[PDB]
Design a protein around this ligand. Structure first.
Ligand SMILES: *[B]([O])([O])C1=[C][C]=C2[C]=[C][C]=[C]C2=[C]1
Length: 566
């Protein structure tokens, strides 16, 4: 975090405020909801388009006081008209630029957008779930502006949900009603709201697509796995993530005590007293301290976050994750809806800024033992089996006699994204009606149009297509500009919003009306396939064999003598 990047962020925040006002119109409107009337307004885009905007729609009771760490409750209906011409605050979190805690405990809202409140036909409804490691993110239009998607005749909905310890505290004690996954339960309630109210905004409740990137993709997957959401939607898109990625879940039940102690709790480790203390702490204190919870051992074993989605220790009415996601894949209703998955062509490039602050990490590639899947590794990672397995990973990613930064980031692409995708695909194939899954590979590189995550990963001057690089061609953000109609950036926006809208509509991502798809034949993956095929999205759109396949198989070989765990 550099203060050049902070003042420039501050000014760009000042520019966004002014530009947001300028793009507002006097055309206010009112829609019905099952909780009562809401007022939206129409807004403009830098491409001189327009959309109706409804923000700050509550799908839940504000989870403050006694509701903190609890499952969300249905909100209270109102007489009259709720104001929805302004956004609400984001979930309490550390601002990844300024480094200070921001946002609010009062954050359970969604936003609805559409270019036409009164469409002649019922429209496809796309529900976006933002990523951010389940610890940062927002549905604010400064990061996720609908300006591109509203060029299309869809209804787009952006949700928030509780982040970090406030979203994912978990306690073993059944008396306390904090089993965990509050934030995922937030997601479930927002979906239930969407199913029952999208018609009011011109949306077809029988054609809803959920999609998300990173932790949003893992989230989308959880919404496809849990029985809580059965039938609530009809297509799913997992962008650079799913629920069996190693970062997408953790058993965090022991960590609440550690948080409390970091916050000055005095007493013993029992769930009741830990909870009573955590209930009274300022929310900003728990979030700022969240960074210190993980032990050095956990960090070494690649646990990324102290609080996240978890296997709930006991069952409740609102339980989302009754067992490990791999098990949930066995019985998952979501296995039988049209699915599209994909990754970018150099995911691990995202880890530059972290590698820069911790150069020693590259030495981990000398044996690679710390990247062996945890379920296979011994605790000390000194077992000869673990050294053998680490050697397989090393052979896959270390190019010379000494490991480099790029070898590290390439390995990261597979550890965090490609290999879990592979495991999910093969697992899913053993438990599905036969509905298609399509693979894309996002391979479009540009520095002419960016999003704020590039400022976070310090990918300025850096070639390749990182984790989150594709967000730029889906959503408006306050660093974006109006691009020339014939620019490669503008055309990629059209293709990406076009493919996504196409799949949402029909469950098949192909359309010959999308420019560049003239010679594309986009077939979904079959159980019998030994080599994955994917739509490689670059300046050219091209069906190719997944380049990463060789390394994927090499990761898979670690499981040769433990096939039951694959
Ligand atoms: B994604 O933005 O939810 C995401 C954030 C941070 C990560 C750290 C380590 C591995 C994977 C990540 C994904």
């Amino acid at each position: 975090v550099s203060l050049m990047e902070k003042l420039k962020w501050k000014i760009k925040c000042i520019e966004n405020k002014f530009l947001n006002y300028r793009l507002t119109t006097n055309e206010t409107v009112v829609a019905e909801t099952e909780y009562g009337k809401v007022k939206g307004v129409k807004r403009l885009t830098v491409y001189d388009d327009s959309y109706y905007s409804f923000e700050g729609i509550p799908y839940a009771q504000p989870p403050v006081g006694e509701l903190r760490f609890k499952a969300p409750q249905r909100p209270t209906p109102w007489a009259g008209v709720r104001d929805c011409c302004n956004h609400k605050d984001k979930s309490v979190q550390v601002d990844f630029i300024t480094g200070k805690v921001c946002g609010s405990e009062d954050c359970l809202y969604l936003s609805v957008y559409t270019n036409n409140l009164n469409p002649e036909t019922k429209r496809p409804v796309l529900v976006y779930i933002h990523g951010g490691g389940f610890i940062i993110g927002e549905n604010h239009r400064d990061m996720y502006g609908p300006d591109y998607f509203i060029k299309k005749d869809v209804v787009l909905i952006n949700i928030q949900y509780r982040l970090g310890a406030l979203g994912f505290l978990s306690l073993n004690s059944e008396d306390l009603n904090v089993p965990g996954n509050a934030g995922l339960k937030d997601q479930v309630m927002a979906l239930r709201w969407i199913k029952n109210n999208c018609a009011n905004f011109g949306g077809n409740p029988d054609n809803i697509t959920v999609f998300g990137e990173s932790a949003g993709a893992a989230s989308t997957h959880y919404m496809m796995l849990t029985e809580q959401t059965r039938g609530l939607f009809h297509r799913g898109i997992l962008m650079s993530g799913n629920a069996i990625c190693p970062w997408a879940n953790t058993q965090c039940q022991h960590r609440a005590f550690t948080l409390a102690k970091l916050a000055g709790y005095k007493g013993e480790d029992n769930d009741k007293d830990v909870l009573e203390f955590l209930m009274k702490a300022k929310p900003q204190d728990l979030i700022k301290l969240e960074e210190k919870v993980l032990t050095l051992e956990e960090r070494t074993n690649k646990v990324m976050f102290p609080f996240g989605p978890t296997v709930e220790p006991y069952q409740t009415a609102d339980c989302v994750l009754p067992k490990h996601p791999r098990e949930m894949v066995k019985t998952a209703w979501g296995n039988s809806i049209p699915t599209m998955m994909g990754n970018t062509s150099y995911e691990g490039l995202f880890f530059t800024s972290i590698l820069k602050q911790m150069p020693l990490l590259v030495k981990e590639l000398e044996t690679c033992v710390n990247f062996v899947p945890s379920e296979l590794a011994d605790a000390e990672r000194t077992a000869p089996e673990t050294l053998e397995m680490g050697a397989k990973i090393k052979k896959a990613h270390v190019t010379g006699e000494t490991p480099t930064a790029d070898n590290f980031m390439d390995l990261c692409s597979h550890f965090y994204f490609w290999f879990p995708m592979h495991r999910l695909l093969q697992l899913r194939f053993n438990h599905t009606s036969g509905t298609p899954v399509y693979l894309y590979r996002f391979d479009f590189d540009s520095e002419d149009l960016i999003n704020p995550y590039r400022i976070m990963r310090s990918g300025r001057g850096v070639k390749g297509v990182s984790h989150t690089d594709e967000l730029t061609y889906f959503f408006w953000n306050q660093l974006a500009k109006r691009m020339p109609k014939e620019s490669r950036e503008y055309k990629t926006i059209e293709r990406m919003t076009g493919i996504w809208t196409q799949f949402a509509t029909t469950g098949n991502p192909y359309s010959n009306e999308i420019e560049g798809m003239e010679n594309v034949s986009w077939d979904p993956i079959e159980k019998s396939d030994e080599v994955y095929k994917c739509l490689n999205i670059s300046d050219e759109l091209k069906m190719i064999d997944v380049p990463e396949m060789g390394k994927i198989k090499q990761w898979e070989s670690m499981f040769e003598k433990h096939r039951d765990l694959f």
